[PDB]
Each structure stands twice: as structure tokens, then as C-alpha cells.
Amino acid sequence: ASRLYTLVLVLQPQRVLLGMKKRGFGAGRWNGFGGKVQEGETIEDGARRELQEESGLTVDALHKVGQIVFEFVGEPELMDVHVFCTDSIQGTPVESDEMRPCWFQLDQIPFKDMWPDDSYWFPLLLQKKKFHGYFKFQGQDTILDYTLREVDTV
Numbered sequence: 001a002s003r004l005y006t007l008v009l010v011l012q013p014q015r016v017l018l019g020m021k022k023r024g025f026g027a028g029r030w031n032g033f034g035g036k037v038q039e040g041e042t043i044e045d046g047a048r049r050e051l052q053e054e055s056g057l058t059v060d061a062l063h064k065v066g067q068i069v070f071e072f073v074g075e076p077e078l079m080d081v082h083v084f085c086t087d088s089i090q091g092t093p094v095e096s097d098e099m100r101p102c103w104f105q106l107d108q109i110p111f112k113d114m115w116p117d118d119s120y121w122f123p124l125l126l127q128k129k130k131f132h133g134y135f136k137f138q139g140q141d142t143i144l145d146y147t148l149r150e151v152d153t154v
């Protein structure tokens with residue numbers, strides 16, 4: 001009962017790229033670049049595609065950094081999110097009708113205007129740790145329960 005998603009963070013030594021989603025699920029929050037994996041696409045090819053479509057950047061190497069399952073109470077389908085990270089990109093970020101990318105200094109990550117789970121796992125991503133997480137949500141603002149652990153292999 002799970003649907004595959006990817007999420008990609010462009011993380012450089014002193015800054016990270018986030019996008020403000022303007023419409024759809026997650027609108028009004030800053031997040032990485034991501035979406036549903038398509039038929040006939042590998043997860044990693046999905047991640048490259050999402051990044052390229054939503055940010056305008058061309059990515060070279062992608063690195064697996066985590067897997068997070070999200071459950072929304074009342075909704076049958078779980079989100080199975082494969083998280084990736086890259087510091088090897090070409091192009092400049094592009095704002096579109098769907099998404100406004102912005103660079104953030106690592107000391108000014110806008111946690112209060114991100115999904116609340118990011119407060120837990122983003123610091124692990126920043127310190128180059130790999131993780132497996134589960135978050136149970138009620139609606140879009142409230143984490144009822146979660147688990148999060150560091151792993152050697154995603």
C-alpha cells in the first residue's frame with residue numbers, strides 16, 4: 001500500500017537549495033525537489049527528472065541518503081520517499097508557476113515553513129548521515145508518531 005516518490009536536496013558546502021511550492025500538495029512550504037516515480041523509470045531516474053523539471057538544474061551524480069515512509073491517518077496509500085542529495089549541478093535555478101527555488105545558508109534553514117518532519121531528518125542529511133524514517137501524520141501539520149534511525153545502507 002505504498003506509492004514511490006523521490007526528494008532531492010542540492011547541498012553545497014555552505015548552502016542548500018530549497019523550493020517554495022506554489023500549488024498542489026505541500027504548497028506554501030519550502031522543500032526539496034521531488035514527485036511521483038513514473039512507469040518504466042528507475043527511482044534514481046525519477047529523482048533526476050524531478051530535480052530538472054522543478055528547479056531547472058541539470059544534475060550529474062545523485063547520492064542515496066535516505067528513505068522515509070509517510071502515513072496520513074484516514075488515507076490508505078503510504079508515501080515511500082527515496083531521498084537523494086547532490087553537490088554536482090549545472091545551470092541556474094529557474095522560478096516557474098509551480099516552484100520558486102532559493103538558496104539558504106545552512107544556519108538559516110526555514111524549518112518553521114517546511115514540513116515538520118524535516119526538523120528531524122534534515123540535520124542528519126546536513127551531517128552526511130543516511131537514514132530510514134517513518135512519520136504518522138494527522139493532516140499536514142501534526143506528527144502523531146515517528147521513528148527515525150541512522151543506517152549504513154539506504
Ligand SMILES: CNc1cc(-c2cccc(Cl)c2Cl)nc(N)n1
Nearest residue numbers: 005006007026034035070081115
Ligand atoms: C509528509 N511530510 C513530507 C512530505 C513531503 C512531500 C510532499 C510532496 C511531494 C513530495 Cl515528493 C514529498 Cl517528499 N516532503 C517532506 N519533506 N515531508
